[PDB]
Design a protein around this ligand. Structure first.
Ligand SMILES: NC(=O)c1ccc[n+]([C@@H]2O[C@H](COP(=O)([O-])OP(=O)(O)OC[C@H]3O[C@@H](n4cnc5c(N)ncnc54)[C@H](O)[C@@H]3O)[C@@H](O)[C@H]2O)c1
Ligand SMILES: NC(=O)c1ccc[n+]([C@@H]2O[C@H](COP(=O)([O-])OP(=O)(O)OC[C@H]3O[C@@H](n4cnc5c(N)ncnc54)[C@H](O)[C@@H]3O)[C@@H](O)[C@H]2O)c1
Lengths: 255, 252, 243, 250
């Protein structure tokens, strides 16, 4: 189904990114992995699927490090057919305590890296007259939360960016869309659970409450489910999906 | 995949609903077809996928004929697991010259049929702890165009109603969502095109340019495959959403 | 600033209706009032402003009675310059337990009436080269809540209709917009109700919007500065749509 | 209306910010002007109204200069009651040709500056138990256009940011909202028109995006901000109100 294609998923070392990479590997795509931490588990999980993978540790804060990432993709697999711009970080604090460099570093990773990713993958997709660009935004690309100045700004930014690219690619076989998940139980969310449990004391309760306050299904979204959505978007049935931000969020945006 | 599930698609004797019912039949759902006209073609298109199908000709602005249509599904299949509220009716006029017969029918078929189909389907989906309600709304559930007062109101209402049902069923394995298509290649839109003694592609361009940046049609089959996706487990936490497939229509 | 203009405000015997009516009448507009319950309190309040107050009790779920409300405006005044489509009800029930007549009634009042008002007022506004049609929709014309199948559908419809009319009138001096309030403290809210409980879940400011706020925004849309606000749906809501 | 108040408008030596300043001065607000060029026709346009105006030329892509802007407001006025984040820069190119310094700079001025003005203005607004923060975003906070990657990302970022701050202040007498204009008749735009029948050129220009074929004016915008500033704006929180001649309706 994706046999012949090369997907690059940024921040695929854990979480959502690793789940999406796994689902694309299962569909037959060769895989360029990226992110910090030990790359071994991710590479192991991908190789189970019978598909080739490499990993580059590029810090996407750093535009030159993004360029080296894409160039390893060029050299190892010939180019990127599917780019999933997923790598992202979170920092919680009132707007007037919001650390100036967390502001900077969230805009860097969560927004600018998405543009740099796009600008580097897009010429080869247009040349090859097929491509998919999927940006992992968030419900926070559509609405705010308290404490999330930087991330909401960045995510909104991605949603808008998605529109521009989806529009500029419209007359080609390249599409660009965003997936806006609600809560997924990854390290990035566990951190928030831990912080909420810090005073008081039940991590399981803090978990429920985190979820209950925003997410009426009371159930987390799974990386696999988001990987299957990406796969959807990569099919022919996604050919006229362009510039869209599709939420998978257990009701978060419905209210 | 959908073996053992019953799907009811309204407006499915031709065009969109037919295209969607076909994808669900191929996935292994039994089908309740519905609509005006000779039901023979659509029933034959479904049967060759090795699935059972029946048809009811319910006029969807008549509550009774809707209740008749659901009684059929009940009495053939035990009820509906997958409900696709799909309705074809458009009328174009400036609002002050918009005929009242047209406003009422458009509201009845495009909006109120969705509430009736829903209230009739949902007790069964809850009891069975699994259901999918998928509402085929439109880009015009999210923006306006000139001359389309009734249509835009109805489709916007569907997108709102989707969110209520979506929230109401959120703690269950029943979900409700809307798909919001731009220009879709229908038999009627095709007619409009081959209306040309001499180049059908430029016809298509001229049609789509204003609203649809891709200059290319969404197909009934692209829509069927998204229905199908919404019905997979990867659809489980898609709730109260309104997903556009529109060639870029809503991106500008 | 609206002297010698006529405003017809639906559902203006009471509440948001009456408070919008007051602001317009204060600004100098003659007022056609509407609704149930007894209009003398309303008529004395709008006339306290020294502007002609005239009332019709039409049930707007009835098309013929909407036309008789307008016929009055036409005969007292030579027609409507400002249309405020405000009349609205509510029923709370889960969709599968939602009464069929409540669904039909909420659709007719909360949506169809707005179109009927619109199609009745607009020709006179085009002909006289100036008009405002302002729809009181709701937060629920942008997001849903549980129990509000009919209401959410009707107010989303109003928001979409507003777009169509906003676009159709975009090359004239007539504009058409919606205001989308959150919780206002009114009998039809105090129904739902202490109050910092009903507010807490939905409205982060934990404070009510007032009909006077809403009336002032109406005046703003009626002014020269609303001249290029068209087909918009502007929320007044304590943060409800921000999250 | 605003006698006793201080309004800081960024990008106010012409165009939109100046229109907005003039409307706030007419209402009685003291006025801190910011922006490039000669400040004199602007400082005198506000003096017409009998309020105090000071100008600071800060480059809002430089955080140190944003902070000196707020320091100056502090010293001359005791702080900002009304903050209007208006300054905006633009560059048009397809995404894959989008110049990297142009991406950085658009994000800096049209997005990051809004963060910085906010975090500086808000402590004082809170302390005094009253404030308004109004971000002039764009319809490009809500939709995209071709060629505008950076401008659209930034203005979206503004609209999201505005939601967050309108939520974090929701239980206070500080509100934060966005105004999203379509095409505004600004000196750059006026020179676009001049270069192209003035009225045909206007219509040829607005036809695609703005149904009314007519401009939003700086004046109209000023009057909205004044409205956001009244008591009837008190429960408007985290909103993005479009003024666009029908741009977002379609
Ligand atoms: N979990 C959620 O609820 C949620 C919801 C919506 C959107 N998202 C988005 O999902 C994305 C992935 O998040 P997650 O929850 O899987 O988080 P995660 O922390 O589990 O993983 C983040 C991934 O990004 C990598 N990464 C971190 N900084 C990097 C950098 N500078 N350069 C390159 N790679 C880097 C990490 O090594 C890791 O692979 C993020 O954009 C987040 O914004 C998450
Ligand atoms: N109340 C809120 O929290 C709030 C929030 C968002 C939107 N709104 C909207 O504001 C509008 C006014 O509601 P409100 O709070 O003042 O409620 P209200 O019940 O206090 O006033 C409603 C008015 O409409 C009139 N009316 C009722 N049914 C009518 C009918 N059948 N035909 C003609 N007139 C009729 C009533 O007689 C009354 O004068 C509604 O459309 C409502 O949806 C209110």
């Amino acid at each position: 189904t994706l046999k012949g294609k090369t997907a690059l998923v940024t921040g695929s070392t854990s979480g959502i990114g690793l789940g999406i990479a796994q689902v694309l590997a299962r569909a037959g795509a060769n895989i360029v992995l990226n992110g910090f931490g030990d790359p071994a588990p991710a590479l192991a999980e991908i190789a189970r699927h019978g598909v080739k993978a490499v990993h580059h540790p590029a810090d996407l804060s750093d535009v030159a490090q993004i360029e080296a990432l894409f160039a390893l993709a060029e050299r190892e697999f010939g180019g990127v057919d599917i780019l999933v711009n997923n790598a992202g970080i979170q920092h919680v604090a009132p707007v007037e305590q919001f650390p100036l460099e967390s502001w900077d570093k969230i805009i860097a990773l969560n927004l600018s890296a998405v543009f740099h990713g796009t600008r580097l993958a897009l010429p080869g997709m247009r040349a090859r007259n097929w491509g998919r660009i999927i940006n992992i935004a968030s419900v926070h690309g559509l609405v705010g939360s308290t404490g999330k100045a930087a991330y909401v700004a960045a995510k909104h930014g991605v949603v808008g960016l998605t529109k521009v690219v989806g529009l500029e690619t419209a007359t080609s076989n390249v599409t660009c869309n965003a997936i806006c998940p609600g809560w997924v139980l990854t390290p990035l969310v566990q951190k928030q659970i831990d912080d909420r449990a810090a005073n008081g004391g039940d991590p399981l309760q803090a978990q429920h409450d985190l979820l209950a306050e925003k997410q009426p299904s009371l159930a987390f979204v799974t990386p696999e489910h988001l990987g299957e959505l990406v796969l959807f978007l990569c099919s022919e049935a996604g050919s006229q999906v362009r510039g869209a931000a599709w939420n998978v969020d257990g009701g978060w945006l419905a209210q």
